[PDB]
Design a protein around this ligand. Structure first.
Ligand SMILES: OC[C@H]1O[C@H](O[C@H]2O[C@H](CO)[C@@H](O)[C@H](O)[C@H]2O)[C@H](O)[C@@H](O)[C@@H]1O
Length: 433
């Protein structure tokens, strides 16, 4: 039968290949989904897709889009509205049993242009054997890192951010938590410095970035261009504090069982032998999960994203992936049917428990079987309820490149002058409409 191509970030390729393989057993030979990988950064994911869409690649069917690409892809006509499903089923499927934060990321001008499949929100991860209590706010993060440094313990604050989208995400979370916003609601005005309250919020966020950058024991790689992984930095013992998306939980257990985490040698537990399956995925029994998780609790804990102001939780920038059907497809009906299978209940459970990516289905966050294997479920659902959002705008690509070039390196931030530079660069981006 026909093949529905399914483009996804390469780092999620194995997870989505597995989901596609399950979805291929249930179409009655009518068709096959074929996963195809995209590059690592959101901007290169977008670029590969945009070049196929403008090139009229008629083999491109389903795309897993970062949440920030909806406006551009809807406005360009590249993502079909869900109302273009010939079966008329896609819109109701996308909303039913789906958390509202993820859904909002999939809309443009009051219509859905994609079906959420994964969401994302950052948590604090820490070494409980080195850090007595998890820092509750950024001042406490800095104080704990300085303490670790003076004790000769690992002292980096490993935030998943370099010089790209992740740095923009970090800034956006600090900014919205402080009451600021990059753009107005409609995306037509820059709101970083246009009122005193907005300017004060921008300055407070930049002050946090600069303070973290210049804390004793800070990662010397802030001032370098080389890409870094906060996930690997922590797994290697180079940081005892990490701010990152929740896939690091699955990664900690799997890499520990593979032998890749020196302070958690789960591969030396005979009961865990053979729990990595034949293509490299940790697939434990219930007992093996208990053993691995219980052992991990001595050296790996999680907690809310640090607060920006003492006494109120942060507003944490939402992330994730939405499934869109490309205007190029020669088989809209099967592409939308594939989208519904790829996000069904069983595959949502899989994408979180094995793939490490937070599910979008509200039912799972209320399901004790899911909660038992996804122990950060309550913090995740709370942070998705009061999430910050990056600006929705068709010129997001240019806005984010401009903002990230100003913010990096964060050691060079001067709150007041950087605030004005950010606002001017943001204005250049939206002056391309
Ligand atoms: O779970 C890990 C995912 O990490 C990246 O995506 C997240 O981080 C991006 C950069 O800050 C955000 O734009 C995105 O919305 C987040 O989901 C990576 O791009 C994904 O492939 C990973 O699944």
């Amino acid at each position: 039968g026909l093949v529905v191509s399914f483009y996804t970030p390469a780092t999620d390729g194995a997870t989505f290949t597995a989901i596609a393989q399950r979805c291929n057993q249930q179409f009655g030979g009518r068709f096959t989904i074929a996963q195809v990988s995209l590059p690592r950064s959101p901007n290169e994911q977008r670029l590969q897709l945009a070049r196929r869409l403008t090139g009229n690649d008629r083999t491109l069917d389903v795309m897993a889009l970062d949440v920030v690409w909806t406006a551009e892809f809807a406005e360009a006509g590249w993502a079909l509205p869900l109302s273009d499903d010939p079966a008329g089923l896609a819109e109701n499927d996308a909303v039913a049993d789906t958390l509202p934060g993820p859904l909002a990321t999939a809309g443009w001008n009051h219509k859905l242009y994609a079906a959420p499949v994964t969401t994302n929100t950052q948590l604090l991860w820490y070494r409980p054997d080195l850090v007595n209590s998890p820092p509750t706010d950024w001042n406490a993060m800095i104080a704990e890192a300085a303490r670790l440094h003076a004790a000769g313990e690992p002292s980096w604050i490993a935030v998943q951010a370099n010089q790209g989208e992740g740095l923009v995400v970090w800034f956006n979370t600090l900014l919205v938590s402080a009451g600021g916003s990059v753009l107005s609601e409609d995306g037509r005005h820059v709101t970083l410095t246009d009122t005193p309250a907005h300017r004060a919020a921008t300055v407070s966020a930049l002050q946090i970035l600069k303070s973290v950058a210049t804390t004793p024991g800070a990662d010397p790689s802030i001032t370098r261009t080389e890409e870094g992984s906060a996930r690997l930095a922590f797994e290697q013992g180079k940081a005892a504090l990490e701010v990152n998306w929740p896939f690091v939980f699955a990664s900690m257990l799997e890499n520990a069982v593979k032998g890749g985490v020196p302070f958690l040698p789960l591969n030396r537990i005979p009961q865990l032998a053979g729990s990595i399956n034949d293509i490299g995925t940790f697939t434990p029994s219930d007992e093996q999960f208990r053993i691995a998780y219980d052992a991990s609790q001595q050296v790996f804990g999680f907690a809310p994203y640090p607060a920006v102001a003492p006494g109120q939780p942060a507003k944490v920038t939402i992330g994730g992936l939405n499934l869109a059907v490309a205007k190029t497809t020669r088989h809209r009906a099967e592409a939308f049917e594939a989208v519904r299978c790829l996000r069904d209940q069983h595959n949502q459970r899989y994408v979180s428990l094995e793939g490490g990516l937070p599910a979008v289905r509200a039912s799972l966050y209320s399901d004790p079987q899911f909660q038992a294997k996804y122990p950060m479920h309550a913090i995740i659902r709370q942070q998705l309820t009061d999430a910050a959002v990056r600006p929705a705008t068709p010129v997001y690509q240019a806005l984010s490149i401009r903002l990230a070039a100003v913010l990096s390196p964060i050691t060079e931030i001067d709150p007041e002058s950087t605030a004005d530079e950010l606002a001017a660069q943001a204005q250049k981006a939206i002056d391309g409409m």
